[PDB]
Amino acid sequence: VSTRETVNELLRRIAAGDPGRIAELYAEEVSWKLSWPAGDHMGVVPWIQQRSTRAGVEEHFRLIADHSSAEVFSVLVDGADAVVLGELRNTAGPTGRSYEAPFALHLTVENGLVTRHHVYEDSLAVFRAF
Amino acid sequence: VSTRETVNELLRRIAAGDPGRIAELYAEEVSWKLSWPAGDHMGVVPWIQQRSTRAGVEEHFRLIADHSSAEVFSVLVDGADAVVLGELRNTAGPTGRSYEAPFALHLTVENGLVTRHHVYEDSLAVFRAF
Ligand SMILES: O=[N+]([O-])c1ccc2oncc2c1
Ligand SMILES: O=[N+]([O-])c1ccc2oncc2c1
């Protein structure tokens, strides 16, 4: 079924929290990218690290939940590709500092499965929270 | 004419540099957003500041040129809205430090004019270059 249907189902599963069910939406192999410097992968902001498979995606959603709300402004869809436009308004577990990060979430869907997850977000604001 | 045609014309005018001609593509009033913290607008990275009108957009393109290449991976179009996905690979004028920032450029087009320009990019990588 559709690219847009797949994405809306992803947003609702993400809003609902269960990481295993979130990962169920993801392809076995996943292209995972983040607008964070190479050298700061697995740095002070802990989820920032490279990922490659569904199980990796699962561990990611378990980890943002360990270390808060989110608004979705729009969802642009153009074929197999989509961009979720919103804002993260969370608070960093360790430092206690509350932060807001605008994000654009780029997704690709093939056969109802997410094959790409590329986050573009205010990396410096998140970083200063940690 | 189309949303996608308008955008491709913007990319080519940007690649060609002339700021006045770049701004000619922009609406009189423009919604201008950046994935940078509020408190760092007009900070050490100098173009990071709020903008509101065509002339503001023009000064922006004069300023990134004062203070290097760019690749466009894709352009997603969904109605009046588009997202340009690429990477900035420039080098900071003052510090000499070379940087790479992935970006997603969100655009809205109305009557062939850009009314919104919302950049989502690796703010921390740019920031560390300055
Ligand atoms: O879930 N994500 O795609 C995601 C990925 C990286 C992030 O940094 N800050 C919030 C955030 C969210
Ligand atoms: O031109 N832009 O939309 C833009 C806006 C903000 C930027 O920060 N680093 C590169 C960059 C480019």
Side-chain angles (χ1 to χ4, degrees), chain A residues 47-104:
Chain A
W47 53 97
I48 307 307
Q49 60 157 96
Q50 282 309 7
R51 310 251 184 209
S52 324
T53 54
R54 182 178 305 144
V57 178
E58 166 179 329
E59 217 72 22
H60 165 249
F61 287 102
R62 328 193 65 125
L63 186 78
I64 49 64
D66 266 43
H67 295 138
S68 79
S69 45
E71 186 178 24
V72 167
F73 297 126
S74 94
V75 171
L76 311 198
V77 191
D78 183 17
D81 285 300
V83 174
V84 193
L85 297 172
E87 194 174 58
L88 259 282
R89 269 141 31 209
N90 291 26
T91 301
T95 76
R97 304 157 151 168
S98 178
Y99 74 85
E100 321 192 327
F103 72 87

Short mmCIF file of all heavy atoms in Angstrom, two decimals, chain A residues 47-104:
data_model
loop_
_atom_site.label_atom_id
_atom_site.label_comp_id
_atom_site.label_asym_id
_atom_site.label_seq_id
_atom_site.Cartn_x
_atom_site.Cartn_y
_atom_site.Cartn_z
N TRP A 47 22.39 8.63 20.95
CA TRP A 47 21.81 7.92 19.82
C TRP A 47 22.53 8.21 18.51
O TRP A 47 22.43 7.41 17.57
CB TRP A 47 20.31 8.23 19.69
CG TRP A 47 19.96 9.67 19.64
CD1 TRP A 47 19.72 10.41 18.53
CD2 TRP A 47 19.78 10.54 20.76
NE1 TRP A 47 19.41 11.70 18.88
CE2 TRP A 47 19.44 11.81 20.24
CE3 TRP A 47 19.88 10.39 22.14
CZ2 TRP A 47 19.19 12.91 21.06
CZ3 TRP A 47 19.64 11.47 22.95
CH2 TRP A 47 19.29 12.72 22.41
N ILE A 48 23.30 9.29 18.45
CA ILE A 48 24.02 9.66 17.25
C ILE A 48 25.08 8.60 16.95
O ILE A 48 26.20 8.65 17.48
CB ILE A 48 24.64 11.06 17.39
CG1 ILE A 48 23.57 12.08 17.81
CG2 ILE A 48 25.36 11.49 16.11
CD1 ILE A 48 22.34 12.10 16.92
N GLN A 49 24.74 7.64 16.10
CA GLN A 49 25.70 6.62 15.69
C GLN A 49 25.17 5.94 14.44
O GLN A 49 23.98 6.00 14.14
CB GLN A 49 25.93 5.58 16.79
CG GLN A 49 24.67 4.84 17.20
CD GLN A 49 24.98 3.50 17.84
OE1 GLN A 49 25.02 3.38 19.07
NE2 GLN A 49 25.18 2.48 17.02
N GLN A 50 26.06 5.30 13.70
CA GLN A 50 25.59 4.70 12.47
C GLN A 50 24.81 3.43 12.77
O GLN A 50 25.01 2.76 13.79
CB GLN A 50 26.75 4.44 11.51
CG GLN A 50 27.25 5.70 10.74
CD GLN A 50 26.16 6.54 10.02
OE1 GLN A 50 24.95 6.31 10.14
NE2 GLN A 50 26.62 7.54 9.27
N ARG A 51 23.84 3.16 11.89
CA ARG A 51 22.95 2.01 12.00
C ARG A 51 22.75 1.43 10.61
O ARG A 51 22.91 2.12 9.60
CB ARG A 51 21.60 2.41 12.61
CG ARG A 51 21.72 3.21 13.87
CD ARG A 51 21.28 2.39 15.06
NE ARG A 51 21.30 3.18 16.28
CZ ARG A 51 21.51 2.67 17.48
NH1 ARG A 51 21.71 1.37 17.60
NH2 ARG A 51 21.53 3.45 18.55
N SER A 52 22.39 0.14 10.57
CA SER A 52 22.40 -0.57 9.29
C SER A 52 21.22 -1.53 9.06
O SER A 52 20.92 -1.83 7.90
CB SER A 52 23.71 -1.35 9.15
OG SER A 52 24.75 -0.59 9.73
N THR A 53 20.55 -2.02 10.10
CA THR A 53 19.54 -3.06 9.94
C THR A 53 18.35 -2.76 10.84
O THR A 53 18.38 -1.84 11.67
CB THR A 53 20.09 -4.44 10.27
OG1 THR A 53 20.67 -4.42 11.58
CG2 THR A 53 21.15 -4.87 9.26
N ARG A 54 17.28 -3.54 10.66
CA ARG A 54 16.07 -3.34 11.44
C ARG A 54 16.38 -3.33 12.93
O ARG A 54 15.99 -2.41 13.65
CB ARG A 54 15.04 -4.44 11.13
CG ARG A 54 13.72 -4.28 11.88
CD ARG A 54 12.73 -5.35 11.50
NE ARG A 54 12.51 -5.39 10.06
CZ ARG A 54 12.31 -6.51 9.37
NH1 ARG A 54 12.29 -7.67 9.99
NH2 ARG A 54 12.13 -6.46 8.05
N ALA A 55 17.11 -4.35 13.39
CA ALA A 55 17.47 -4.46 14.80
C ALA A 55 18.23 -3.23 15.27
O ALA A 55 18.02 -2.75 16.39
CB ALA A 55 18.29 -5.74 15.03
N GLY A 56 19.12 -2.69 14.43
CA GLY A 56 19.74 -1.42 14.76
C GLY A 56 18.73 -0.32 14.95
O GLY A 56 18.78 0.43 15.93
N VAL A 57 17.78 -0.21 14.01
CA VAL A 57 16.71 0.77 14.14
C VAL A 57 15.96 0.56 15.44
O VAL A 57 15.62 1.53 16.14
CB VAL A 57 15.76 0.70 12.92
CG1 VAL A 57 14.62 1.67 13.09
CG2 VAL A 57 16.51 1.00 11.64
N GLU A 58 15.74 -0.70 15.82
CA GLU A 58 15.03 -0.96 17.06
C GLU A 58 15.80 -0.40 18.25
O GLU A 58 15.23 0.27 19.11
CB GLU A 58 14.77 -2.45 17.25
CG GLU A 58 14.33 -2.78 18.67
CD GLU A 58 14.05 -4.26 18.90
OE1 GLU A 58 13.63 -4.96 17.96
OE2 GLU A 58 14.27 -4.73 20.04
N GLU A 59 17.10 -0.67 18.31
CA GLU A 59 17.87 -0.20 19.44
C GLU A 59 17.87 1.31 19.52
O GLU A 59 17.91 1.88 20.61
CB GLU A 59 19.31 -0.74 19.38
CG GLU A 59 19.87 -1.09 20.76
CD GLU A 59 19.24 -2.34 21.33
OE1 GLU A 59 18.70 -3.15 20.55
OE2 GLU A 59 19.30 -2.51 22.57
N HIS A 60 17.79 1.98 18.36
CA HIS A 60 17.72 3.43 18.35
C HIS A 60 16.49 3.92 19.10
O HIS A 60 16.57 4.82 19.94
CB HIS A 60 17.69 3.94 16.92
CG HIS A 60 17.26 5.36 16.81
ND1 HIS A 60 16.06 5.74 16.25
CD2 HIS A 60 17.87 6.51 17.21
CE1 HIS A 60 15.95 7.06 16.30
NE2 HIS A 60 17.04 7.55 16.87
N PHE A 61 15.33 3.33 18.80
CA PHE A 61 14.11 3.79 19.44
C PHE A 61 14.07 3.40 20.91
O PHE A 61 13.45 4.10 21.72
CB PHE A 61 12.89 3.27 18.67
CG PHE A 61 12.67 3.98 17.35
CD1 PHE A 61 13.03 3.38 16.16
CD2 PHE A 61 12.12 5.25 17.32
CE1 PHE A 61 12.85 4.04 14.95
CE2 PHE A 61 11.93 5.92 16.10
CZ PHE A 61 12.29 5.31 14.92
N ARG A 62 14.75 2.31 21.31
CA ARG A 62 14.87 2.08 22.74
C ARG A 62 15.75 3.13 23.40
O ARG A 62 15.53 3.48 24.57
CB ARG A 62 15.42 0.68 23.03
CG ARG A 62 15.04 -0.38 22.03
CD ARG A 62 15.35 -1.78 22.56
NE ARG A 62 14.55 -2.12 23.73
CZ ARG A 62 13.79 -3.21 23.81
NH1 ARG A 62 13.72 -4.04 22.78
NH2 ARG A 62 13.08 -3.45 24.90
N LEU A 63 16.71 3.69 22.66
CA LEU A 63 17.70 4.55 23.30
C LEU A 63 17.22 6.00 23.44
O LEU A 63 17.41 6.60 24.50
CB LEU A 63 19.03 4.48 22.55
CG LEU A 63 20.15 5.25 23.26
CD1 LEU A 63 20.69 4.45 24.43
CD2 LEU A 63 21.26 5.59 22.30
N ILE A 64 16.61 6.59 22.40
CA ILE A 64 16.03 7.92 22.57
C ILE A 64 15.01 7.92 23.71
O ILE A 64 14.84 8.93 24.41
CB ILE A 64 15.40 8.45 21.26
CG1 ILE A 64 14.49 7.40 20.63
CG2 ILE A 64 16.45 8.95 20.27
CD1 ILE A 64 13.33 7.08 21.48
N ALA A 65 14.35 6.79 23.94
CA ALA A 65 13.37 6.71 25.01
C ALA A 65 14.02 6.67 26.39
O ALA A 65 13.41 7.12 27.37
CB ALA A 65 12.48 5.49 24.79
N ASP A 66 15.24 6.15 26.49
CA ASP A 66 15.94 6.14 27.77
C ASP A 66 16.53 7.51 28.10
O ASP A 66 16.35 8.02 29.21
CB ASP A 66 17.05 5.08 27.77
CG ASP A 66 16.59 3.77 28.35
OD1 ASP A 66 15.46 3.34 28.01
OD2 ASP A 66 17.34 3.17 29.15
N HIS A 67 17.24 8.10 27.15
CA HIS A 67 17.88 9.39 27.34
C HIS A 67 16.95 10.55 26.98
O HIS A 67 17.18 11.69 27.35
CB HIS A 67 19.17 9.46 26.51
CG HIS A 67 20.22 8.49 26.94
ND1 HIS A 67 20.98 7.76 26.04
CD2 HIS A 67 20.65 8.11 28.17
CE1 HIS A 67 21.82 6.99 26.69
NE2 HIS A 67 21.64 7.18 27.99
N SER A 68 8.56 15.41 27.35
CA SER A 68 9.13 15.41 26.01
C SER A 68 8.09 15.06 24.93
O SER A 68 7.35 14.08 25.08
CB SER A 68 10.32 14.45 25.95
OG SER A 68 9.91 13.11 25.83
N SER A 69 8.04 15.86 23.85
CA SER A 69 6.96 15.81 22.86
C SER A 69 7.50 16.08 21.46
O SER A 69 8.66 16.43 21.26
CB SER A 69 5.86 16.82 23.18
OG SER A 69 6.42 18.08 23.52
N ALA A 70 6.61 15.96 20.48
CA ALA A 70 7.00 16.16 19.09
C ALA A 70 5.78 16.58 18.28
O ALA A 70 4.70 16.01 18.43
CB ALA A 70 7.61 14.89 18.49
N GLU A 71 5.97 17.59 17.42
CA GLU A 71 4.93 18.12 16.55
C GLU A 71 5.30 17.88 15.09
O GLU A 71 6.46 18.09 14.69
CB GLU A 71 4.71 19.62 16.77
CG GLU A 71 3.50 20.19 15.98
CD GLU A 71 3.25 21.69 16.25
OE1 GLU A 71 4.21 22.39 16.65
OE2 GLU A 71 2.12 22.17 16.04
N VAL A 72 4.33 17.46 14.29
CA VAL A 72 4.55 17.24 12.87
C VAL A 72 3.81 18.34 12.11
O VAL A 72 2.58 18.41 12.13
CB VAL A 72 4.08 15.85 12.41
CG1 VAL A 72 4.02 15.81 10.89
CG2 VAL A 72 5.05 14.79 12.93
N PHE A 73 4.58 19.18 11.42
CA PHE A 73 3.98 20.27 10.67
C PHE A 73 3.38 19.79 9.35
O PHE A 73 2.27 20.20 8.99
CB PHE A 73 5.01 21.36 10.44
CG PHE A 73 5.51 21.99 11.70
CD1 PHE A 73 6.87 22.05 11.97
CD2 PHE A 73 4.62 22.51 12.63
CE1 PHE A 73 7.34 22.62 13.14
CE2 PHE A 73 5.08 23.10 13.80
CZ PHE A 73 6.45 23.15 14.06
N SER A 74 4.07 18.91 8.63
CA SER A 74 3.60 18.44 7.33
C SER A 74 4.33 17.17 6.93
O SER A 74 5.36 16.80 7.51
CB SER A 74 3.77 19.51 6.25
OG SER A 74 4.99 19.33 5.55
N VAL A 75 3.79 16.50 5.92
CA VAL A 75 4.40 15.31 5.35
C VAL A 75 4.32 15.45 3.84
O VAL A 75 3.23 15.35 3.26
CB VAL A 75 3.74 14.02 5.82
CG1 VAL A 75 4.27 12.84 5.03
CG2 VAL A 75 4.00 13.83 7.31
N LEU A 76 5.46 15.70 3.21
CA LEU A 76 5.54 15.79 1.76
C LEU A 76 5.85 14.41 1.22
O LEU A 76 6.73 13.72 1.76
CB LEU A 76 6.62 16.79 1.34
CG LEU A 76 6.63 18.18 2.00
CD1 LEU A 76 7.45 19.14 1.17
CD2 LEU A 76 5.20 18.74 2.22
N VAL A 77 5.11 13.99 0.19
CA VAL A 77 5.29 12.68 -0.44
C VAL A 77 5.48 12.88 -1.93
O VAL A 77 4.72 13.62 -2.57
CB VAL A 77 4.09 11.75 -0.16
CG1 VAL A 77 4.40 10.31 -0.59
CG2 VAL A 77 3.73 11.78 1.31
N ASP A 78 6.52 12.24 -2.50
CA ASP A 78 6.85 12.31 -3.94
C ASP A 78 7.36 10.93 -4.35
O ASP A 78 8.56 10.66 -4.44
CB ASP A 78 7.87 13.42 -4.24
CG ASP A 78 8.17 13.57 -5.73
OD1 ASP A 78 7.39 13.08 -6.57
OD2 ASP A 78 9.21 14.20 -6.04
N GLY A 79 6.42 10.03 -4.58
CA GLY A 79 6.74 8.68 -5.06
C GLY A 79 7.04 7.74 -3.90
O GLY A 79 6.20 7.55 -3.01
N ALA A 80 8.22 7.13 -3.93
CA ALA A 80 8.62 6.27 -2.84
C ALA A 80 9.25 7.05 -1.69
O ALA A 80 9.56 6.45 -0.65
CB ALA A 80 9.59 5.20 -3.34
N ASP A 81 9.43 8.36 -1.85
CA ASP A 81 10.16 9.17 -0.90
C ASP A 81 9.22 10.15 -0.20
O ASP A 81 8.27 10.65 -0.81
CB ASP A 81 11.31 9.92 -1.59
CG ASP A 81 12.47 9.00 -1.91
OD1 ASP A 81 13.04 8.42 -0.97
OD2 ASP A 81 12.82 8.87 -3.10
N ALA A 82 9.49 10.39 1.08
CA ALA A 82 8.70 11.32 1.88
C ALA A 82 9.62 12.12 2.80
O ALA A 82 10.71 11.67 3.16
CB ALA A 82 7.65 10.60 2.72
N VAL A 83 9.16 13.32 3.17
CA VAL A 83 9.86 14.14 4.14
C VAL A 83 8.87 14.57 5.22
O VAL A 83 7.90 15.27 4.94
CB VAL A 83 10.51 15.38 3.50
CG1 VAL A 83 11.09 16.26 4.60
CG2 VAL A 83 11.59 14.95 2.52
N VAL A 84 9.14 14.16 6.45
CA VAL A 84 8.36 14.60 7.60
C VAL A 84 9.01 15.85 8.17
O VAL A 84 10.19 15.83 8.55
CB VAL A 84 8.27 13.49 8.65
CG1 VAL A 84 7.20 13.84 9.68
CG2 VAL A 84 7.99 12.18 7.96
N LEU A 85 8.23 16.92 8.25
CA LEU A 85 8.67 18.22 8.74
C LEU A 85 8.01 18.44 10.09
O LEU A 85 6.78 18.43 10.20
CB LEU A 85 8.25 19.32 7.77
CG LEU A 85 8.83 19.29 6.36
CD1 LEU A 85 8.12 20.36 5.56
CD2 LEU A 85 10.33 19.55 6.35
N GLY A 86 8.82 18.61 11.12
CA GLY A 86 8.29 18.87 12.45
C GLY A 86 9.34 19.47 13.35
O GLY A 86 10.32 20.03 12.89
N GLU A 87 9.11 19.32 14.66
CA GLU A 87 9.98 19.87 15.69
C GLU A 87 10.01 18.92 16.88
O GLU A 87 8.96 18.47 17.33
CB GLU A 87 9.49 21.25 16.13
CG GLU A 87 10.49 22.07 16.94
CD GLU A 87 9.98 23.49 17.21
OE1 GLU A 87 8.89 23.63 17.80
OE2 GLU A 87 10.67 24.45 16.83
N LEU A 88 11.22 18.59 17.34
CA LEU A 88 11.46 17.88 18.60
C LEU A 88 11.55 18.89 19.74
O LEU A 88 12.36 19.81 19.70
CB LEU A 88 12.77 17.10 18.54
CG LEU A 88 12.78 15.60 18.29
CD1 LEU A 88 12.41 14.85 19.57
CD2 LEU A 88 11.83 15.27 17.16
N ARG A 89 10.72 18.70 20.77
CA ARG A 89 10.79 19.52 21.98
C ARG A 89 10.88 18.56 23.17
O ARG A 89 9.87 18.22 23.79
CB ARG A 89 9.58 20.46 22.09
CG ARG A 89 9.81 21.83 21.46
CD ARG A 89 8.56 22.35 20.74
NE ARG A 89 7.34 21.88 21.38
CZ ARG A 89 6.19 21.68 20.74
NH1 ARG A 89 6.10 21.91 19.44
NH2 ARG A 89 5.13 21.25 21.42
N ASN A 90 12.10 18.11 23.46
CA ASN A 90 12.38 17.17 24.54
C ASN A 90 13.26 17.84 25.59
O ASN A 90 13.51 19.04 25.55
CB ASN A 90 13.07 15.91 23.99
CG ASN A 90 12.16 15.07 23.13
OD1 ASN A 90 11.21 15.57 22.54
ND2 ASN A 90 12.45 13.77 23.06
N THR A 91 13.74 17.04 26.54
CA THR A 91 14.64 17.52 27.58
C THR A 91 15.67 16.44 27.87
O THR A 91 15.33 15.28 28.08
CB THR A 91 13.88 17.94 28.84
OG1 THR A 91 12.94 18.97 28.52
CG2 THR A 91 14.83 18.46 29.88
N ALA A 92 16.94 16.84 27.88
CA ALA A 92 18.05 15.90 27.95
C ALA A 92 18.11 15.25 29.33
O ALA A 92 18.29 15.94 30.34
CB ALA A 92 19.37 16.60 27.64
N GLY A 93 17.99 13.92 29.36
CA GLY A 93 18.06 13.13 30.57
C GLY A 93 19.16 13.50 31.55
O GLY A 93 18.89 13.75 32.73
N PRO A 94 20.43 13.50 31.10
CA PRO A 94 21.54 13.83 32.02
C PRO A 94 21.58 15.27 32.50
O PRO A 94 21.56 15.52 33.71
CB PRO A 94 22.79 13.48 31.20
CG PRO A 94 22.32 13.36 29.78
CD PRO A 94 20.92 12.87 29.87
N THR A 95 21.67 16.24 31.58
CA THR A 95 21.91 17.63 31.97
C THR A 95 20.68 18.31 32.55
O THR A 95 20.82 19.32 33.25
CB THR A 95 22.41 18.44 30.77
OG1 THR A 95 21.31 18.73 29.90
CG2 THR A 95 23.47 17.67 30.00
N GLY A 96 19.48 17.80 32.27
CA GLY A 96 18.26 18.47 32.64
C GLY A 96 17.85 19.61 31.73
O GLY A 96 16.78 20.18 31.93
N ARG A 97 18.67 19.95 30.73
CA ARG A 97 18.42 21.11 29.89
C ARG A 97 17.38 20.78 28.82
O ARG A 97 17.49 19.78 28.11
CB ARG A 97 19.72 21.58 29.24
CG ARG A 97 20.88 21.92 30.18
CD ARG A 97 22.22 21.83 29.45
NE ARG A 97 23.25 22.71 29.98
CZ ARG A 97 24.54 22.63 29.65
NH1 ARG A 97 24.95 21.70 28.80
NH2 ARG A 97 25.42 23.48 30.18
N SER A 98 16.37 21.65 28.69
CA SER A 98 15.30 21.43 27.72
C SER A 98 15.68 22.08 26.40
O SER A 98 16.24 23.18 26.38
CB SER A 98 13.98 22.01 28.25
OG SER A 98 12.93 21.86 27.31
N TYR A 99 15.36 21.40 25.29
CA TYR A 99 15.80 21.83 23.97
C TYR A 99 14.68 21.66 22.94
O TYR A 99 13.74 20.88 23.11
CB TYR A 99 17.07 21.08 23.51
CG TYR A 99 16.85 19.64 23.08
CD1 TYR A 99 16.46 19.33 21.79
CD2 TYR A 99 17.07 18.58 23.97
CE1 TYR A 99 16.27 18.02 21.39
CE2 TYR A 99 16.87 17.27 23.58
CZ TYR A 99 16.47 17.00 22.29
OH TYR A 99 16.28 15.70 21.88
N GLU A 100 14.80 22.41 21.86
CA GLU A 100 13.91 22.30 20.71
C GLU A 100 14.77 22.14 19.47
O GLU A 100 15.67 22.95 19.24
CB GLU A 100 12.99 23.53 20.59
CG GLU A 100 12.48 24.07 21.95
CD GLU A 100 11.35 25.10 21.81
OE1 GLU A 100 11.34 25.85 20.81
OE2 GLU A 100 10.48 25.15 22.72
N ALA A 101 14.51 21.11 18.69
CA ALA A 101 15.25 20.87 17.45
C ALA A 101 14.27 20.73 16.30
O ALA A 101 13.49 19.75 16.28
CB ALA A 101 16.13 19.63 17.57
N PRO A 102 14.24 21.67 15.36
CA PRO A 102 13.52 21.42 14.11
C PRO A 102 14.13 20.25 13.36
O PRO A 102 15.35 20.05 13.37
CB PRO A 102 13.69 22.73 13.33
CG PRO A 102 13.84 23.78 14.42
CD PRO A 102 14.60 23.09 15.53
N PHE A 103 13.27 19.46 12.72
CA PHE A 103 13.75 18.33 11.94
C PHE A 103 13.00 18.22 10.63
O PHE A 103 11.83 18.59 10.52
CB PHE A 103 13.64 17.00 12.71
CG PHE A 103 12.22 16.51 12.85
CD1 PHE A 103 11.63 15.73 11.87
CD2 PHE A 103 11.48 16.82 13.98
CE1 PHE A 103 10.33 15.29 12.00
CE2 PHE A 103 10.18 16.37 14.13
CZ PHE A 103 9.60 15.60 13.12
N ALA A 104 13.71 17.69 9.64
CA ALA A 104 13.14 17.18 8.42
C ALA A 104 13.57 15.72 8.32
O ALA A 104 14.77 15.44 8.30
CB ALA A 104 13.61 17.99 7.20
#
